[PDB]
Amino acid sequence: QHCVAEVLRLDPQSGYLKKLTNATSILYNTSLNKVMLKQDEEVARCHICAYIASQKMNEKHMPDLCYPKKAKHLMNLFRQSLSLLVKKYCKMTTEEIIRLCNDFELPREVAYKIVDEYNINASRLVCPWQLVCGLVLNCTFIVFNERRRKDPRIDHFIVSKMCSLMLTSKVDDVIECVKLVKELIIGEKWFRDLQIRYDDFDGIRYDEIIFRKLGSMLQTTNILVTDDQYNIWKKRIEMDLA
C-alpha cells in the first residue's frame, strides 16, 4: 500500500487519487487471481495499470501518463485478458528545456514561464539555445544572490557549468546571451513580480540603491564589516593556543 501510494502519487512528477488507488488495487487483484497472467515482473507492475485506471473513472489524458517494449505487450495482453549557437534553426520541446532548467534544481514555475516565452515567441528565431540560455542564467542570478553575496566562488563554477553544458571554450558569447535577453525581457509584469520576490535590482537592494543614486553620502558601501562577523571571527583566535 506504501508502494501503491508511492507509484500512484508518482504521476504528478479530488476523486482521482482515491478512485485510482482503488482501481490499482482491484486491478492488481484481478490480474493475480486467475492463473492466466504470469511472468510479469513486479519491477514495473503499476503503470499501464495506472493508465487504464485513468481511462476508466471519467477523464483521461494521453500525455504525461505513460511517461517501453512490453508496455505495449502487457497493455494488449491485459486488455485481451479482461557548438550550440552556430547551429542554425534547431528545435526544442517542453521537456527538453525542462531538463536544461531542472539541471539547476530550479522550480518548475520559472521553467513554465520560459516555456510560455518560447511557445509564444519561438517564431522569429535564429537559435533558441541562446534565448533559453540567457533566460535560465537570469533566473539563476536573480534567485541565487544570497549564496553568491557571501560566496564569490560561485560565479566561476556556474558559468563554467553552462559553458560546457553547451560545449564551448569561448564564453563572451554567453555574456551576450545574458545581456541581450536582459535587453529583451526587461519590462514584463511577471519579470517584475520575480524582481520584487527575490530582490536583485542589478543584484542590490532597493532601500540601499535609492540612496546610492539619488545623491547621498549616507549610502552604505559596506567596506567595513558587520558586528556579528567579528562576534564570530573572535572564536577562531580564542583557541589560538592549540
Partner: protein, 601 residues
C-alpha cells in the same frame, strides 16, 4: 474474479458492525489494543464470519493466498482512522485466524486438500534461525551512482532488474543492504505425536515456515496447532529429475500456539506474607512437598531445607560462606529413590534433571562441542552450570569415572569450574545446590558398619554434605498396610505447588533475614559439649562443618517462615536435624549416644 468490490465492502462491513452478544464489537478492542501496542498482527475468529457466510470460505478456498489481498489493506484502513501515522510507522499488517474445525494428520494430506485451508497437529522441534529476508528493495547502480525505488517482493522469487530510469541499460546491479528493510523468516521442523502412531506404522515428518514477526514463540518439546495453507516448492535445479517429475510440499502457516513466565502480583505476595507469618507453615510444607509417595517426613524435611537456599556472605569479600544447601540420600533400591527428585525438577525454578551416561540430557560437565548446524562451536555446561543460582539433581551418583567425579568435587569445593583446553581458558559461577543418589553395595545398608566402610565412596566430597540420610528395609506389617494400599489405590491442607514455586520465586528475591547475637554463645556451649561427648563413646568426631551447616539451616528456616531474622526456638529444629543425622550414620556403638545427646533435643 473482479468481485473484490462486493467482497471488500461486505468484509469491511463485517469488520466494523460485527455484533454477537450485547451488541459487542469485539474487534474494536483488537485494533485499538494493536495501535496501543505498536503491534504488527491481528486475529479474526473464523467461526463467526463462517457462521454468517461460508462462500467467504469458498472464494478463500479456491485461492486463499489471493484471499489475503483485501484483508491486509483493510487492516490499515481501520487502523489509520483510529491511529493516524501508524501507516507511517508500521509499513504493513499481517493477520491470524482461530477456531477451524477440520483436522488432518501429518500423513493424511492428499492432493485434493492443498491450495486451501489446512490445519495440522504435531510438535515443534529443531528450531533454526530467526533469519532476516527482504520486503523493500533499493540499489547501488554503477553506470549511474544512484538507486531504485521501493518494491514489495512476492512469496516465491528473487528479483533482478535490467531497466534503468535514466536509460535501458542492464548495468551491474547490487542491493543496498546498508539501507534496505527486512522481515523475519524461520525454517522449522515438525513431527507427529508418538502417543498416537498406531500399531506398526511410523510417524511422518514435514517442514514449516514461520513469519510475521512471530518467530521464537516456540521451543523444543511443545504441542502445536498450525493452521495455514499448503503448496509445492519450485526451487530450481529441477530438470535433473530422474524417476517421475514429482515435487516436495511445504506449509505457509499463519496462526500458532503452544498448548496442544511465572511472576507475582500484589495480592499474590500479600497472601504469601499472610500465610508465612501465621503460625508455623512448615508442617504444612512437608505435608505438601511431594505426595508422590506417602513415604516419610524426615528426608522431605532435609530436602525442604535444600529447596529454598540460605544466604551467602563474605567478610568484606573474604571468608565466604555458602548460603545454598546440599543433600545426599542412600538406601536399598526397593523404595522410591528416583521419583521425588524428578518431581522437584517439575516443581522448581531453573531446575534440571541431568544424569550420568545413558538417558541423560548432558554429561554433567562443560566442553567444546560441535553443533549439527554449520559446525557452531559452543560451550555447554553441566546442569550444575545452569542453576548457579538454583539446584542440580542427580541419580546414581556412583556410576561415574575419574573426571566426572572431580568436576562435582570442584563444584562443592570452590563453587567454580575451570577449563584449560582448546584455546580457551575460563572460570564460571557454580554456586549450585547439589542433590544426588546412589545404590548401596548389596541392596541392604549393612547396618553393622559405618558409612564409608559400607559404601565405597570417598570422603573429601562426602564431607560437603550437611545431610547424609539413609533408610533400609522397612519390615513391619504397617509398612505393608500403608504402602500396598496406596500403590493399589494409585489404580483403583496441603497447598498448590504453583503457589509453592511462586513462594520460592518470591523468597530468593526479597528476604535475607538476619540473626541477632543475643544468646548465640550457646552455640559455643553445646558445640564444645558434644565435641567432647563424641570421644566419650564414639570413634569419629563431629566438626565445625556441621556447625556452619546448622547456621545455614537456621537461616534456611528463616527464609521458610519468611520471618525478619532468626528465631531461637527453631534452632532447636536445625540442630535436632543434624543430631539425628549423625545418629543413624554410625555403628550400633552409637546406641549410647541415643541416650546421651537427647538433652539437646
Amino acid at each position: 474474479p473482479n468481485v473484490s468490490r462486493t467482497i471488500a465492502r461486505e468484509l469491511k462491513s463485517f469488520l466494523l458492525e460485527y455484533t454477537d452478544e450485547t451488541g459487542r464489537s469485539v474487534y474494536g478492542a483488537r485494533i485499538r489494543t494493536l495501535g496501543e501496542m505498536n503491534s504488527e498482527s491481528l486475529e479474526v475468529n473464523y467461526r463467526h464470519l463462517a457462521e454468517s457466510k461460508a462462500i467467504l470460505a469458498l472464494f478463500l478456498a479456491k485461492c486463499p493466498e489471493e484471499m489475503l489481498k483485501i484483508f491486509d489493506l483493510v487492516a490499515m484502513e481501520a487502523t489509520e482512522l483510529h491511529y493516524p501515522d501508524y501507516a507511517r510507522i508500521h509499513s504493513e499488517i499481517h493477520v491470524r485466524i482461530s477456531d477451524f474445525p477440520t483436522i488432518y494428520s501429518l500423513r493424511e494430506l492428499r492432493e485434493s486438500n492443498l491450495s486451501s485451508l489446512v490445519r495440522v497437529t504435531g510438535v515443534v522441534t529443531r528450531r533454526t534461525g530467526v533469519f532476516p529476508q527482504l520486503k523493500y528493495v533499493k540499489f547501488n547502480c554503477l553506470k549511474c551512482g544512484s538507486i531504485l525505488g521501493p518494491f514489495f517482493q512476492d512469496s516465491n522469487e528473487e528479483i533482478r532488474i535490467s531497466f534503468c530510469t535514466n536509460c535501458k541499460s542492464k548495468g551491474p546491479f547490487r542491493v543496498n543492504g546498508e539501507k534496505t528493510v527486512y522481515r523475519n523468516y524461520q525454517r522449522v521442523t515438525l513431527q507427529e505425536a508418538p502417543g498416537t502412531v498406531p500399531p506398526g506404522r511410523l510417524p511422518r515428518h514435514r517442514e514449516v515456515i514461520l513469519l510475521a514477526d512471530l518467530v521464537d514463540v516456540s521451543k523444543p518439546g511443545e504441542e502445536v496447532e498450525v493452521t495455514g495453507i499448503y503448496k509445492n516448492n519450485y526451487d530450481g535445479n529441477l530438470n535433473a529429475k530422474n524417476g517421475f517429475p514429482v515435487f516436495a510440499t511445504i506449509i505457509e502457516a499463519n496462526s500458532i500456539k503452544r498448548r496442544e513466565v511465572f511472576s507475582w502480583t500484589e495480592e499474590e505476595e500479600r497472601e504469601f506474607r499472610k500465610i508465612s507469618r501465621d503460625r508455623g507453615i512448615i508442617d504444612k510444607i512437608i505435608s505438601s512437598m511431594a505426595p508422590s509417595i506417602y513415604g516419610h517426613r524426615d528426608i522431605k524435611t532435609a530436602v525442604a531445607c535444600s529447596l529454598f537456599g540460605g544466604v551467602p556472605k563474605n567478610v568484606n569479600g573474604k571468608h565466604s560462606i555458602r548460603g545454598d544447601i546440599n543433600v545426599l540420600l542412600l538406601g536399598d533400591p526397593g523404595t522410591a529413590k528416583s521419583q521425588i527428585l524428578k518431581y522437584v525438577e517439575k516443581t522448581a525454578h531453573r531446575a534440571v534433571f541431568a544424569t550420568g551416561q545413558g538417558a541423560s540430557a548432558v554429561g554433567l560437565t562443560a566442553s567444546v562441542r560441535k553443533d549439527p548446524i554449520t559446525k557452531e562451536w559452543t560451550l555447554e555446561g553441566g546442569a550444575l552450570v545452569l542453576a548457579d543460582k538454583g539446584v542440580c539433581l542427580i541419580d546414581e551418583f556412583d556410576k561415574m569415572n575419574d573426571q566426572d567425579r572431580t568436576s562435582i568435587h570442584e563444584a562443592m569445593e570452590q563453587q567454580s569450574i575451570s577449563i584449560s583446553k582448546a584455546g580457551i581458558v575460563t572460570t564460571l559461577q557454580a554456586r549450585c545446590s547439589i542433590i544426588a543418589a546412589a545404590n548401596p553395595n548389596g541392596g541392604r545398608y549393612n547396618s553393622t558398619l559405618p558409612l564409608a566402610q559400607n559404601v565405597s565412596l570417598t570422603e573429601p566430597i562426602l564431607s560437603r554434605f550437611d545431610i547424609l540420610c539413609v533408610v533400609r528395609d522397612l519390615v513391619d506389617e504397617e509398612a505393608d498396610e500403608r504402602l500396598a494400599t496406596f500403590v493399589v489405590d494409585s489404580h483403583v491442607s496441603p497447598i498448590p505447588q504453583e503457589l509453592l514455586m511462586k513462594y520460592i520465586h518470591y523468597a530468593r528475591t526479597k528476604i535475607y533475614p538476619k540473626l541477632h547475637q543475643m544468646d548465640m554463645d550457646k552455640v559455643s556451649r553445646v558445640y564444645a559439649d558434644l565435641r567432647r561427648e563424641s570421644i566419650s563413646t564414639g570413634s569419629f568426631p563431629i566438626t565445625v562443618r556441621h556447625l556452619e551447616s546448622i547456621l545455614r539451616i537456621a537461616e534456611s528456616f528463616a527464609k521458610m517462615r519468611l520471618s525478619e531474622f532468626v528465631s531461637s526456638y527453631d534452632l532447636d529444629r536445625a540442630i535436632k536435624v543434624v543430631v539425628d543425622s549423625f545418629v543413624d550414620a554410625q555403628k550400633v556403638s552409637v546406641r549410647r549416644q541415643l541416650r546421651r545427646s537427647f538433652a539437646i533435643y
